[PDB]
Every structure is written in C-alpha cells, then in structure tokens.
Amino acid sequence: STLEIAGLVRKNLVQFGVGEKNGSVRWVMNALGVKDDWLLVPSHAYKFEKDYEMMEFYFNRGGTYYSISAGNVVIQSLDVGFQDVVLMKVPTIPKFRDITQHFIKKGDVPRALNRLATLVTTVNGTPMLISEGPLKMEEKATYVHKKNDGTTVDLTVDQAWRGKGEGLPGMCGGALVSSNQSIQNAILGIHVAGGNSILVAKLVTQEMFQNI
Ligand SMILES: *C[C@H](NC(=O)OCc1ccccc1)C(=O)O
C-alpha cells in the first residue's frame, strides 16, 4: 500500500545539513538512504555555495548526528547532464535498509501517469504525507533555487514529475510514491521544487542505481 511504502521511506529519510568546521549547522532539506551507505540528495542543497568541499556535511538520523567533510563523500550522477538529485556515499553513516527495489522501473513509468501520488517527506524531521494530484511527466522541468546570499539560479533537469499540491520549505529530498497498487505503489523520484501549487520531483528509476 501507499502507507507501507511510506513507512519504508520514512525510516530511510535523514535530515541533511551543512556547516563550516566548528560552526553552526544549517539544516537544509531531507536526504534518502537507498542501500548500504548511499543516499539520494538534491545537489542544489550544497553545490551552489562557495567552497562547498571545505564544509562539513551533517546527517541527522532520528536525533543521532553523523558528520563528514564534504570532500570525503563520494558523489555519483544518475545520468549524463545535470539531474540535481545525485547519489552520495557517506562512509560514516550507518548502513540503510535496501529500498532500491521499491523504485519504479523505467519501463513502468507510464503506469504512474494521470494517477494520484503521495509525497513522503519531512519538514526538519517531522514526517508528512502530502497528496499530489494526477501526475504528469515533463521532459524538461525548470525551477528557481534561492541561495543563501539572496541571488537565484535557474535549474533544469530531464524527466520530472509534476503534480498539483501544496509543499513547504524543507520538503525537498522526500520521496514521491505512486497511488498505483498494480506497480506496488512504486517510489517515483525525489522532490526538488514546489510553487504555485505545483510539486516537482526528479524521476529516479530502479535502473539508475546501476550507476553504483
Ligand atoms: C521493501 C523491500 N522489498 C523488496 O526488496 O522486494 C523485492 C521482492 C519482493 C518480493 C518478490 C520479489 C522481489 C524489502 O525490504 O524487502
């Protein structure tokens, strides 16, 4: 069911934060553990600020905090080009339950179109289920990211789900789950943007985990 998939997502969601060494942590959004010490996270969380590699990354797992130098996480792309969401290996994180087989197969993508979905996310660790209207797929989606200094950047990714719904700051990095039971309520991707009552999630397929 949606609710049981949601519980699996919930247990693998951690809070992602960034800080200078010996400085205060800014909690930014969610990241999703997928297998072993690999997580999915929107790279817009960190990559557009100066000297990101000199920062400490923090992973809050239910009130137990794991940190690592940003230069010591291993980042792997999902596909060629900018996809925002990346795979990130964090050697200091406890192993995750493997949820890769719960993600939609590329061939089954059409089965989630025109159907409801649920964004399974948190705001700063507080779990939320957010209803999304019948889904469409955008071959290219563009959204605006606001940096810490107020300046903005336009981001464009390939293959992003679009659904009517109401998101809040901090919900990025949560997982979109299909209402379609016939594909076992597959996880469809990762929330990257919300606005004008539109929620946007980068498609992530089972096949993309082959990138290791
Ligand atoms: C949610 C996970 N399920 C899973 O990996 O399913 C793979 C499967 C299940 C049944 C038949 C064939 C393959 C889990 O944690 O087990």
Swiss-Prot record:
This is Protease 3C. It comes from the Viruses. It comes from Human hepatitis A virus genotype IB (isolate MBB) (HHAV). The active site is at 44 (for protease 3c activity), 84 (for protease 3c activity), 172 (for protease 3c activity). Residues 1-209 form the Peptidase C3 domain. The chain holds residues 1520 to 1731 of 2227 of the full protein. Cysteine protease that generates mature viral proteins from the precursor polyprotein. In addition to its proteolytic activity, it binds to viral RNA, and thus influences viral genome replication. RNA and substrate bind cooperatively to the protease. Cleaves IKBKG/NEMO to impair innate immune signaling. Cleaves host PABPC1 which may participate in the switch of viral translation to RNA synthesis. It is found in: Host cytoplasm. Homodimer; disulfide-linked.
